[PDB]
Amino acid sequence: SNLGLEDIIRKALM
Amino acid sequence: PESADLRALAKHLYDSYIKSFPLTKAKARAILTGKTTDKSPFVIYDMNSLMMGEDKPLQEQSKEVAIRIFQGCQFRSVEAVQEITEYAKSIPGFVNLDLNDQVTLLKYGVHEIIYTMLASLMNKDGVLISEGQGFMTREFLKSLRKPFGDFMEPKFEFAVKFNALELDDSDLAIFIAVIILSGDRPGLLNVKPIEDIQDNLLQALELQLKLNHPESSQLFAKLLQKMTDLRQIVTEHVQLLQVIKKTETDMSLHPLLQEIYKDLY
Numbered sequence: 001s002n003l004g005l006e007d008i009i010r011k012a013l014m
Numbered sequence: 015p016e017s018a019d020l021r022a023l024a025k026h027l028y029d030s031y032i033k034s035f036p037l038t039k040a041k042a043r044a045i046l047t048g049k050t051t052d053k054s055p056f057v058i059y060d061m062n063s064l065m066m067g068e069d070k071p072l073q074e075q076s077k078e079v080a081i082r083i084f085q086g087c088q089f090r091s092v093e094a095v096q097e098i099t100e101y102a103k104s105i106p107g108f109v110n111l112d113l114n115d116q117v118t119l120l121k122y123g124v125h126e127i128i129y130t131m132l133a134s135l136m137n138k139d140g141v142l143i144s145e146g147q148g149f150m151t152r153e154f155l156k157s158l159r160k161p162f163g164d165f166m167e168p169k170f171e172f173a174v175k176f177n178a179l180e181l182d183d184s185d186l187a188i189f190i191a192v193i194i195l196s197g198d199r200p201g202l203l204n205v206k207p208i209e210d211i212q213d214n215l216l217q218a219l220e221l222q223l224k225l226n227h228p229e230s231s232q233l234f235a236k237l238l239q240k241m242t243d244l245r246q247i248v249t250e251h252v253q254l255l256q257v258i259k260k261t262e263t264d265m266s267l268h269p270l271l272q273e274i275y276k277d278l279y
């Protein structure tokens with residue numbers, strides 16, 4: 001719950 | 015040769031869009047029209063039909079109902095976010111961009127794209143919900159208690175106008191790629207290569223609209239204005255955040271209506 005939109009995106013880019 | 019390359023770029027994008035997005039505009043419209051094999055969506059048009067619907071539970075409190083809606087819809091957006099991210103990797107030049115910039119471009123871009131997706135699920139009468147098996151009317155949503163009754167109306171207003179352009183998937187692929195390669199997002203490290211890819215995409219889009227819609231008048235121009243409307247729609251959503259935090263009490267909402275809103279954006 002401290003992991004936001006950027007985490008989802010970064011994960012998906014990797 | 016220049017034009018051949020603009021056509022090849024459009025095709026690449028279209029093929030990549032079909033690979034990345036299972037929920038296409040053609041599939042939404044086949045459900046909205048009836049062409050589809052299977053039986054039609056259930057229509058929620060009043061409280062009775064709401065209660066008679068159950069195709070989808072804990073007791074939500076008063077001054078949280080709206081924030082819990084925004085949070086919940088944003089969380090259910092993740093599979094879209096991932097789909098958009100995947101599509102973005104296929105846009106020539108994008109993964110050769112600065113990782114930091116890839117992330118920024120998507121962080122802002124996804125919301126505009128999600129609204130474009132939302133438009134495919136809408137017509138002037140209503141919106142598809144519950145994986146395309148339900149249909150919630152515009153009139154019903156507009157009739158709900160303040161502030162909720164004003165949540166969706168502006169998205170319908172945009173969607174009617176946007177859908178009036180009559181774009182298909184092949185057009186939308188390039189449109190969405192143009193939205194993602196916006197060199198004006200806050201915090202971009204190296205803009206030059208971004209605005210350069212977007213210029214190429216803008217060429218491709220112009221030619222695509224000419225070839226796919228030879229009859230139309232200022233379709234390129236009208237479509238570019240929709241980026242403003244999307245921008246505008248995204249910047250706004252905050253103005254809804256702060257009407258909530260001090261509204262003429264109370265914000266009860268029936269639990270099936272709270273469930274339905276979490277399917278929107």
Ligand SMILES: *c1ccc([N+](=O)[O-])cc1C(=O)Nc1ccc(-c2nc3cc(C)ccc3o2)cc1
Binds near residue numbers: 084278
């Ligand atoms: C969810 C369900 C229903 C409604 N509604 O108005 O009926 C709205 C929402 C909702 O939460 N919409 C929503 C949430 C966030 C944003 C948003 N977040 C952003 C972050 C950044 C960095 C840029 C732009 C953003 O837009 C838009 C809309």
